[PDB]
Symmetry: C2
């Protein structure tokens, strides 16, 4: 097979906006699980108050991903964060995303929830169609494949809490078998629906403390968390950066287990681990760290750890380190595996083991922890070196285990090339992103692998990333430059300068580059037969070195050829070639019309032939006058030399006539100057004599002429002849004409289209002003070398950087020796450095978009929470307590008002009970409660029959004074005796009320029945029924009386909590009073007024005969 490596990695995890923040939290000991109210008001439905949650879910750069504003709102937050994280993952390894476009790379996403689909389709009258494209589970992989153009498999697994690791296993199988060249593995989980946390709590899996206390005695459950993590698996032939190598990954199911479906099986996990480490040929001792599941459940942890002990720790001597990343960030169910992988890889990169929180004592059910065979990482531990393992075990029964061989690549041995300055080019969605990349590059200026990887990913079209920047590192004058990039293709042109540019000690600052040195050596070999070496000439020190014509010409040609070679190395090819008369030679090399040896030989021969003949000295002079006007002005014996621009015209000829005309011009005051050529008037009639031998030599120099590509524009001959044969092919006649015919630089410039990127290819940018004036104002000259500058390598690199800013894609990695891969361990992470445009905030579903009139099922079986109602038996038949309806209506009002019962003081008014509901012995009876808020009325119906009617509304302004105990009409000073619980309920029995233990809550009462003490449990039904019992107790009427109407009832939980006073024993008690004169029963926070009871006929069952 082929090696599988973890090229890249990225993700957003609880209280960690990026992987670097995730690490800062892991080492720093911070607890990423918080007690905030982001997803829902904490404590809702009794859920654990703590849950690790992502910092933000409302950010997404839709424009970059081709998602329209409407489609973005309807998209799932998981998918948006996943697109961003996957793009970060691809770039983390230096693999430019466009390289994988069209590849067979396949996306595997492990997901478990589709709450957004359930939310966005709740109203079938206004739901939008595109909600399914962006929220369907299948689109987690399909959307990534669509954007990135991955032609490989695109699946979305669930696998019940091991989805991420199962996807990693499938991707490893795919890349191993050669089916796919690269893979993207993702894991996503977001908490938006409280009903799911309620389900998990009911199953008994969530921890009331809200913490995953791994490997510890206090283990109760796990804390739910959100996660979005993506990894890039590639075969070793492609990886630019390697974190670890996947030795072997497997999967198996626990099968039939007598205990149940949700019972972890240790035997099967041990079997899988042993089978994998045997198939991979890896000794158990080689392992150094196994990242256990560590969910924190009481039963799971012993099984998993004992299985690990049997499989691995049985036959080794040094102890094994065990860790659980869930103790830090909580438990993202589908994405738990990839979060563990991220933790492990970060710890390996930083040379430490991220400690494990919430561990202060081992679990005594695991002998390994008690002994030394397993060692929990409660504090940082340096990475000694070995193979690691990660296993995620879903509650369905699916297990996954992967062995990892960490990357251990030491920093490269220093080489002289590392001293030379480099160039860093960045492209970002915003200026801040490019500035961030440049800053991070400047921090790590000496890490060649980091810079190479950054430069690899910066080649992205200007349309997608509109801002670009560059920074030369290793030089004193280095500062980041950033500018927005106009879109559209910009043509690239070459302008080769002329005879003037030549100075002492030129090019040595570029000899340190390789391609330049090779080009110079090839030129020296070409000119070796004639006795002079270009390298020696460049290395010379005498200021008279370049006074000779031939030395200057040959060195200039060699330097231009070297520069043109450098531009080619970076993939640059010109769409336009234009040259000054010496330059056309080099220009000819640009188009391939000449071979390098031919061009250098031609330059040398031109120089030597010029030397051979002797002519009277004549200075070529530059005059600032109109070309046509210059024609008339020019005296005899002088002809125009160069049509530099509309204003610039340099005339050459005999020294005396040129001096005379220069004096005349100086009288006029117009611009007058003469370039230095050794007093030679080039491109004038004087050159005619030199021609014949020049043509003779060049004929041998140029054996078989070749066509001049359409790109090359000839300054040698006017456009009228541009169809001519002579000017059609680079030949000896072409060079002779160039040496004779005057220069037509200005003419050739007009064909430079608008928005052209010119490059003054020469040892000195002499024509910057000429080009600036002649060309259209939009163009960009971008000069490459300069005169006397201390470090011309910096100037050339800045030129390439300006080229980059102008739109052209030039990759500077070609200039310097290639960097070996895989990259060394410890290279800075690139995921945190990629920043997006997060100006806009996209819709994210809230907790009110999920289901929560009200219908209640009263189940009186043993398991039902309402089992206490079976004690409310009157006449021998169980009846729903009168106060039971009140509690149901109260909960309904609280739910509608969106508060908890404990936080809602309520008022009932004009209540009427129309019939009694008999709780069946077997089965259930369903009561429905409807509210009319505007009328402030409520109704309770049973199978369509009215039961309770009246008014209920929130109490705007609770006032404690209402619950002060009314002064009793009877002083009762003696108080010799009181009714105990037994006696009061014995009297009630004789009257026919047969309350059971749960409704026995009158600890004591006065003989008259007006005062007493009521026991308080968490149930309001029992407390209010006991108040009604106290009211009934003091009546003189025999037989049983049931409530039929209550005028008004007030309840206030706050005053209720204040009133309750604990007894000497642990019990909580409330003091009650019954004032019959005033018709009020007050106890704690309740106030019953206007109670009316009506006698009920005895059932006369006479079961006793």
């Amino acid at each position: 097979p082929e090696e599988v490596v973890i090229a890249g990695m990225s993700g957003k995890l609880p209280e960690s906006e990026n992987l670097q923040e995730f690490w800062d939290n892991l080492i720093g000991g911070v607890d990423m699980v918080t007690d905030d109210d982001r997803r829902w008001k904490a404590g809702l439905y009794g859920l654990p108050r703590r849950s690790g949650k992502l910092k933000d879910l409302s950010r997404f750069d839709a424009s970059f991903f081709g998602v329209h504003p409407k489609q973005a709102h309807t998209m799932d937050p998981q998918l948006r964060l996943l697109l961003e994280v996957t793009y970060e993952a691809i770039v983390d390894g230096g693999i430019n995303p466009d390289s994988l476009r069209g590849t067979h790379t396949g996306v595997w996403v492990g997901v478990s929830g589709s709450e957004t689909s359930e939310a966005l389709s709740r109203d079938p009258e206004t739901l939008v169609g595109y909600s399914m494209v962006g929220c369907q589970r299948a689109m987690m992989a399909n959307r990534l494949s669509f954007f990135f153009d991955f032609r490989g498999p695109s699946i979305a697994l669930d696998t019940a809490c091991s989805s991420s690791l199962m996807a990693l296993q499938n991707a490893y199988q795919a890349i191993h078998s050669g089916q796919c060249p690269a893979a993207i593995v993702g894991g996503i989980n977001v908490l938006l629906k409280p009903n799911t946390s309620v389900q998990f709590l009911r199953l008994g899996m969530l921890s009331p403390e809200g913490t995953c206390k791994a490997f510890d005695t206090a283990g109760n459950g796990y804390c739910r968390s959100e996660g979005v993590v993506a990894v890039l698996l590639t075969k070793k032939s492609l990886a630019r950066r390697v974190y670890a190598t996947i030795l072997n990954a497997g999967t198996n199911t626990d099968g039939f287990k007598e205990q149940g479906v949700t019972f972890p099986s240790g035997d099967i996990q041990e079997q899988l681990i042993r089978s994998l480490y045997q198939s991979a040929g890896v000794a158990p001792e080689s392992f150094e760290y196994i990242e256990a599941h560590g969910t924190g459940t009481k039963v799971g942890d012993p099984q998993e750890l004992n299985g690990i002990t049997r499989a691995l720790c049985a036959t080794r001597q040094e102890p094994l380190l065990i860790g659980s990343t869930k103790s830090n960030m909580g438990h993202p169910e589908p994405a738990s595996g990839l979060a563990a992988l991220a933790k492990v890889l970060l710890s390996l990169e930083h040379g430490l083991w991220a400690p494990n929180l919430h561990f202060h004592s081992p679990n005594p059910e695991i002998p390994a922890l008690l002994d030394g065979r397993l060692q929990v990482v409660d504090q940082p531990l340096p990475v000694r070196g070995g193979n690691v393992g990660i296993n995620s075990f879903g509650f369905g029964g699916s297990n996954v285990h992967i062995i990892l061989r960490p990357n251990t690549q030491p920093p490269p041995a220093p080489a002289p090339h590392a001293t030379l300055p480099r160039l860093l080019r960045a492209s970002g969605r915003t200026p801040e992103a490019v500035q961030k990349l440049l800053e991070q590059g400047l921090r790590h200026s000496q890490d060649l692998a980091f810079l190479s990887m950054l430069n690899d990913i910066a080649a992205v079209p200007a349309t997608a990333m509109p801002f670009r920047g560059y920074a030369v590192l290793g030089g004193e004058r280095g500062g980041p430059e950033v500018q927005q990039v106009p879109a559209g293709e910009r043509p690239l042109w070459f302008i080769c300068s002329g005879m003037g540019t030549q100075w002492r000690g030129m090019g040595l600052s570029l000899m340190r580059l390789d391609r330049f040195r090779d080009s110079i050596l090839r030129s020296d070999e070409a000119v070796k037969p004639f006795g002079l070496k270009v390298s020696q000439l460049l290395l010379s020190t005498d200021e008279s070195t370049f006074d000779d014509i031939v030395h200057s010409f040959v060195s200039l040609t060699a330097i231009q050829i070297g520069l043109i070679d450098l531009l080619s190395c970076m993939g640059l090819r010109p769409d336009g070639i234009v040259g000054h008369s010496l330059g056309e030679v080099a220009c000819g090399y640009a188009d391939g019309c000449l071979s390098q040896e031919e061009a250098v030989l031609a330059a040398y021969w031109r120089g030597q032939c010029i030397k051979e003949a002797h002519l009277p000295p004549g200075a070529m002079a530059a005059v600032g006058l109109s070309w046509e006007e210059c024609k008339q002005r020019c005296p005899p014996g002088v002809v125009p030399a160069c049509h530099n621009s509309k204003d610039t015209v340099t005339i050459s000829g005999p020294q005396a006539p040129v001096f005379e005309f220069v004096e005349q011009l100086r009288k006029e005051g117009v611009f007058a100057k003469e370039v230095r050529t050794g007093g030679m008037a080039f491109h004038s009639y004087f050159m005619e004599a030199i021609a014949p031998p020049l043509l003779q030599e060049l004929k041998k120099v140029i054996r078989e002429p070749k066509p001049r590509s359409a790109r090359w524009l000839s300054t040698s001959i006017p456009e009228a002849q541009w169809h001519s044969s002579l000017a059609r092919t680079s030949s000896a006649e072409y060079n002779v004409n160039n040496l004779v015919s005057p220069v037509l630089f200005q003419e050739a410039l007009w064909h430079v289209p608008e928005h052209a990127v010119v490059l003054e290819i020469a040892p000195h940018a002499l024509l910057q002003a000429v080009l600036k004036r002649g060309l259209k104002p939009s163009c960009t000259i971008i000069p490459l070398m300069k005169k006397d500058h201390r470090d011309n390598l910096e100037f050339f690199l800045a030129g390439i950087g300006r080229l980059h800013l102008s739109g052209i894609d030039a990759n500077p990695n070609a200039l310097f020796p290639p960097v070996e891969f895989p990259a060394p361990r410890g290279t800075p992470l690139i995921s945190p450095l990629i920043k997006w445009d997060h100006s806009l905030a996209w819709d994210v579903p809230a907790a009110e978009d999920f289901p929560n009139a009200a219908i209640y099922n009263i189940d009186t079986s043993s398991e039902s929470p309402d089992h206490y109602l079976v004690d409310h038996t009157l006449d021998g038949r169980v009846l729903f307590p009168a106060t039971g309806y009140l509690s149901i209506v109260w909960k309904t009002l609280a739910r509608a008002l969106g508060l908890g019962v404990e936080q809602l003081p309520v008022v009932f008014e004009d209540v009427v009970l129309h019939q009694a509901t008999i709780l069946p012995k077997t089965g259930t009876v369903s009561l429905e409660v409807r509210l009319l808020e505007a009328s402030r009325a409520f109704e309770v119906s049973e199978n369509g029959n009215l039961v309770v009617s009246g008014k209920v509304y929130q109490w705007d302004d609770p006032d404690p004074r209402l619950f002060d105990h009314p002064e009793s009409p009877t002083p009762n000073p003696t108080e010799p005796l009181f009714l105990a619980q037994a006696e009061v309920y014995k009297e009630l029995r004789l009257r026919g009320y047969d309350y059971g233990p749960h409704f026995q809550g009158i600890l004591e009462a006065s003989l008259e029945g007006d005062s007493g003490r009521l026991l308080w449990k968490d149930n309001w039904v029992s407390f209010m029924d006991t108040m009604l019992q106290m009211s009934i107790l003091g009546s003189a009427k025999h037989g049983l009386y049931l409530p039929t109407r209550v005028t008004a009832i007030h309840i206030d939980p706050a005053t209720h909590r204040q009133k309750l006073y604990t007894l000497q024993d642990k019990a909580q008690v409330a003091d009650v009073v019954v004032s019959r004169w005033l018709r009020v029963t007050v106890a704690g926070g309740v106030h019953i007024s206007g109670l009316h009871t009506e006698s009920a006929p005895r059932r006369q069952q006479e079961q006793q005969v």
Copy 2:
């Protein structure tokens, strides 16, 4: 080591049972979770191999066959 690949794309019953926080039962997670569509089969038939629940839409069954 036989394994269960199941092509499923609709978990509607999960929503219906989990719509009332007051009276929901934790069993619904075991009986309605998408992943359980295969884990229940593996549990009953005692299969020790893979148990995956693919989700590609309109091609999930044939994708499971290919896997």
